[PDB]
Amino acid sequence: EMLKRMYARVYGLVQGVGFRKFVQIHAIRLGIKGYAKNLPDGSVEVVAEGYEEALSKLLERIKQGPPAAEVEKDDYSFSEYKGEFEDFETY
């Protein structure tokens, strides 16, 4: 398998810092589809599909965030590609 589905969630100073826009820019550069979403607890989740290597690159960016973010904690999982998405959105 060359494709995967990734789920990731980050905590810390991760909302109001341009995080979703940052993830989207990187996802589009990497050819990844899915979305980034602000959650009510202050965390951000990302659901993404595409080449496993590209998803790993996107995860490295997710772990860092844009310069105004500070990611304190994360979790993530890679599972079977479902072919669910057509672009990369934010919510």
Side-chain angles (χ1 to χ4, degrees), residues 2-91:
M2 291 290 287
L3 304 178
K4 284 287 219 286
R5 182 181 188 100
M6 183 178 69
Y7 178 83
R9 186 162 169 197
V10 295
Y11 302 89
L13 168 52
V14 298
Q15 294 190 6
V17 293
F19 206 106
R20 287 172 297 177
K21 166 173 306 298
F22 164 93
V23 177
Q24 178 177 236
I25 282 164
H26 284 289
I28 297 173
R29 210 166 280 174
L30 281 161
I32 292 169
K33 296 176 179 339
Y35 63 90
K37 176 172 175 174
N38 277 4
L39 298 177
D41 65 342
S43 73
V44 182
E45 63 174 15
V46 174
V47 182
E49 287 188 335
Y51 286 110
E52 191 165 359
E53 286 187 316
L55 294 166
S56 290
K57 293 173 180 309
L58 183 62
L59 180 63
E60 296 179 48
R61 296 294 183 171
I62 287 163
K63 287 169 157 282
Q64 177 177 22
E70 180 69 31
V71 175
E72 296 276 82
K73 174 173 203 102
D74 62 65
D75 53 80
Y76 52 95
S77 66
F78 285 68
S79 62
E80 185 173 70
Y81 173 85
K82 293 310 182 172
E84 169 171 4
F85 305 107
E86 12 205 18
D87 58 13
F88 198 100
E89 294 188 293
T90 64
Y91 299 89

